[PDB]
């Protein structure tokens, strides 16, 4: 089996996770489930970025130690993934020693190679903007001992502390030719707009990779006064969870390099500039793709509690496109759950099964062929639906994949209206044509169910149970390659 490795970013537990975090984890889960269905040996990683000044600050506010606050927050994050039915194979926490030993050995290796050197970082910080400015780009400076931010117009404070600096500009030629060798590394194309003002050409200044002003993080083994900064600490999660530099590297050598790093748009530079340069410094292969989504603070728990899991999972992947910034409104939420799920899919299933009970006492007649004049094109549309779905799924166009699936679901409801099986049922001469129509209904529903398995966990399962499709062979993608899979009669369920 071919392998597939997909990661979410490790999330910062400075507060409760909102639907943006739910989007990212469900998106990665859909791709994980999708790839398992295609036959890949899938690993899906997610986790938490638990180091930094903010976490230390937040723990004292809880009236608790850092690890006890963190454990409490991580429990609720983990509980949310259980509720969302996320099929992640591991949960990496940066406070775990399996991570910290990797960050330590990585940092010490960069010291021994001469990649990092001791110095001091003197930067101007804005409390509002959360951005580091330089002496010359301050507005109305008062040699220079204060000033005002060019973005906010708010006064800045002198941030001055000891730091290790990473010489990243020497890997510039290798980075630029990696981009030339992988033109579509950043996906979708629009997320390359976050690469504007990269300063790879004019000169990447040495990157500050450790701080001295706080003690909550991975300590540098040869100079424990320093804590390793988020840049290297957080990014190492993708390789540390695989047991890189441990006594067992089997997961790493099986799953690295990563196929997709999934993320939100504001950390693309993180993953496309700093992360590959760090990997070159460690002489490791680079990730094949970064996939970045947009923005949408709503608690996902309320959405799952009130309307159910499928409703939440569907709405997130349907309404909020990956290549754009989606919008949460509760009006669109109720409409997506009522009109698409409950009506289009749900009435279809009820209509179809009700007629199979009414006319054949549950005995669904075997698929013979396209007997009705509308079947030839509908079967072709079924194959095209799978083909278009695939195109969208390979580009993480989840919104577009789901609408295509609903295109087919609407047409199936349309087919009932234009075949009018109740008219066929009256005439005994039309028994074969009625069974053909019933058969096409059920096969169309199966196509939709299989295609929806990555997105929804409950609904497709119950459709298979209602139609009495027990065979795991009838639930996989490969069974959608040729229409008309049920050539032997089936007993559908009596009371759905």
Residue 91 dihedral angles phi and psi, to the nearest 5°:
-130, 105
Residues 6+ apart with CB under 8 A from 489: 363, 364, 365, 366
Rounded distance, CA 378 to CA 439, Å?
Answer: 13
Sheet containing 186-187: order of strands = 90-93, 41-48, 3-11, 260-264, 290-293, 186-187
Rounded distance, CA 188 to CA 399, Å?
Answer: 13
Q: Which residue has the tokens 């789901």?
A: 402
Dmax over CA atoms of the chain, in Å, equals 99
CB 489 within 8 A of CB 362: no
The first and second tokens of residue 480, run together, are 């959608």
Q: Which residue has the tokens 């004049």?
A: 373
Q: Single out the residue of 230, 238, 195, 242 nearest to residue 8, CA to CA.
A: 238
Calculate Rg over the CA atoms of the chain. 27
Rounded distance, CA 220 to CA 412, Å?
Answer: 62
Using DSSP, how many helices (H) and how many strands (E) does the chain show? 19, 14
Rounded distance, CA 330 to CA 257, Å?
Answer: 40
Q: Which residue has the tokens 């500050």?
A: 208
Rounded distance, CA 454 to CA 27, Å?
Answer: 10
Residues 6+ apart with CB under 8 A from 299: 16, 18, 19
Element (H, E) at 24: helix 19-38
Segments in 256-345 forming alpha helices (H): 268-269, 275-281, 300-307, 309-319, 330-335
Pick left, alpha or beta for residue 154 (phi over 0 → left; psi -120 to 50 → alpha; otherwise beta): beta
The first and second tokens of residue 67, run together, are 């690890």
SS3 128: coil
Residue 277 dihedral angles phi and psi, to the nearest 5°:
-60, -40
Residues 6+ apart with CB under 8 A from 129: 149, 151, 152, 154
CB 35 within 8 A of CB 4: yes
Q: Single out the residue of 228, 4, 226, 211 nearest to residue 94, CA to CA.
A: 228
CB 278 within 8 A of CB 115: no
What pairing do the DSSP bridges indicate for beta strands 260-264 and 3-11?
parallel
Count of residues making up the chain: 496
Q: Resolution of the experimental model in angstroms, please?
A: 2.7
Q: Which residue has the tokens 């005995």?
A: 363
Return the bridge partners of 262, or none.
291
């Amino acid at each position: 089996k071919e392998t597939f490795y997909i990661t979410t970013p490790i999330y910062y537990p400075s507060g409760n996770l909102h639907i943006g975090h739910a989007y990212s984890t469900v998106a990665g889960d859909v791709i994980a489930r999708y790839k398992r269905m295609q036959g890949y040996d899938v690993r899906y990683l997610t986790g938490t970025d638990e180091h930094g000044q903010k976490i230390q600050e937040k723990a004292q506010k809880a009236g608790k130690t850092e690890i006890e606050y963190l454990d409490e927050m991580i429990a609720g994050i983990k509980q949310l993934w259980a509720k969302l039915e996320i099929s992640n194979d591991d949960f990496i926490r940066t406070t775990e020693e399996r991570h910290k030993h990797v960050v330590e050995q990585v940092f010490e290796r960069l010291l021994k190679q001469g990649d990092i050197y001791l110095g001091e970082y003197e930067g101007w910080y804005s409390v509002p903007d959360e951005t580091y400015y330089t002496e010359s780009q301050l507005v109305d400076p008062q040699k220079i001992i204060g000033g005002k931010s060019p973005d906010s117009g708010h006064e800045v404070e002198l941030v001055k502390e000891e730091s290790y600096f990473f010489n990243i500009s020497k890997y510039t030629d290798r980075l630029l030719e990696f981009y030339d060798q992988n033109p579509d590394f950043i996906q979708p194309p629009s997320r390359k707009n976050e690469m504007i003002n990269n300063f790879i050409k004019p000169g990447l200044a040495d990157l500050a990779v450790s701080r001295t002003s706080f003690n909550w993080g991975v300590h540098v083994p040869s100079n424990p006064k320093h804590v390793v900064y988020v840049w290297i600490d957080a990014l190492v999660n993708y390789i540390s969870a695989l047991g890189y530099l441990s006594d067992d590297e089997s997961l790493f050598n099986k799953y690295w390099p990563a196929d997709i790093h999934l993320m939100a748009k504001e950390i693309v530079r993180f993953h496309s500039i700093i992360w590959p340069i760090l990997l070159m410094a460690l002489d490791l292969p680079l990730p094949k793709k970064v996939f970045a989504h947009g923005w949408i603070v709503v608690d996902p728990n309320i959405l799952i509690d009130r309307y159910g899991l499928d409703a939440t999972r569907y709405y997130l992947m349907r309404e909020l496109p990956f290549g754009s910034d989606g919008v949460f409104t509760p009006e669109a939420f109720v409409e997506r759950t009522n009109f698409d799920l409950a009506n289009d899919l749900g009435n279809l299933v009820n209509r179809t099964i009700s007629m199979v009970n009414k006319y054949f006492d549950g005995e669904l007649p075997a698929y013979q062929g396209p007997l009705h004049e509308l079947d030839e094109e509908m079967e072709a549309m079924a194959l095209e639906t799978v083909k278009s779905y695939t195109e969208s799924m390979e580009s993480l166009q989840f919104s577009v994949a789901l609408s295509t699936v609903w295109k087919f679901i609407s047409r199936t409801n349309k087919y009932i209206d234009e075949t009018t099986p109740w008219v066929l049922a009256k005439d005994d001469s039309q028994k074969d044509m009625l069974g053909n129509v019933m058969a096409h209904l059920v096969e169309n529903i199966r196509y939709a169910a299989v295609l929806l398995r990555p997105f929804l966990t409950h609904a497709p399962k119950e459709i298979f149970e209602q139609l009495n499709i027990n065979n795991p062979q009838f639930m996989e993608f490969s069974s959608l390659e040729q229409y008309g899979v049920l050539n032997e009669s089936i007993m559908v369920t009596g009371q759905p």
